[PDB]
Every structure is written in C-alpha cells, then in structure tokens.
Amino acid sequence: MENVVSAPMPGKVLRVLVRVGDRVRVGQGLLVLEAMKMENEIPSPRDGVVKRILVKEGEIVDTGQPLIELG
C-alpha cells in the first residue's frame, strides 16, 4: 500500500500538476520530472487525496526522494 510518491530517478521538478487537498486517481500524472531530454509524468500509485507536496517546481531531486504524500 503506497502512500508516498518518490522520484524514480534523479531529475528536475518541471511542474507540479495537483495541489494539496486534491483528489487523485491511480495512474494520474501528479508532476513532471525532467531527465535526459525527457519529460516523465510521475503517477499517483493509488486513488486518494494529496496531503503534502514536498518539493517545488525547479527543484533538483535524487532517486527515491519523497515528492508527494497521499493522505
């Protein structure tokens, strides 16, 4: 049971697609992570509510780094 969206690889947080409190669906893109001339939509692992967004747009993140917590 997944509660935290973490970075699958290092990247730059290009865009955060949802806000705290928003309802989300499994497989929905929640943010866009840029890496190696590619824009990766990072999905919600489950239906739920966005509780916390732990990064800002522009931020560089490393592998496994927490990005979003679901409530």
Residue numbers in the entry: 79 to 149
Tell me what the authors wrote about this structure, in their words.
This domain adopts a flattened β-barrel comprising two homologous ‘hammerhead’ structures that confer an intramolecular pseudo-twofold symmetry reflecting the gene duplication.
The isoleucine mutant (A138I) and the tyrosine mutant (A138Y) conferring residue 138 with the highest crystal-packing propensities for β-sheet provided better crystallization scores when compared with other constructs, including the wild type. Neither the C orthorhombic nor the trigonal crystals could be obtained with the wild-type protein. On the other hand, the crystal packings of the A138I and A138Y mutants are rich in attractive electrostatic interactions and nonpolar interactions, respectively. In terms of buried ASA, the residue at position 138 in the mutant crystals contributes more to crystal packing when compared with that in the wild-type crystal.
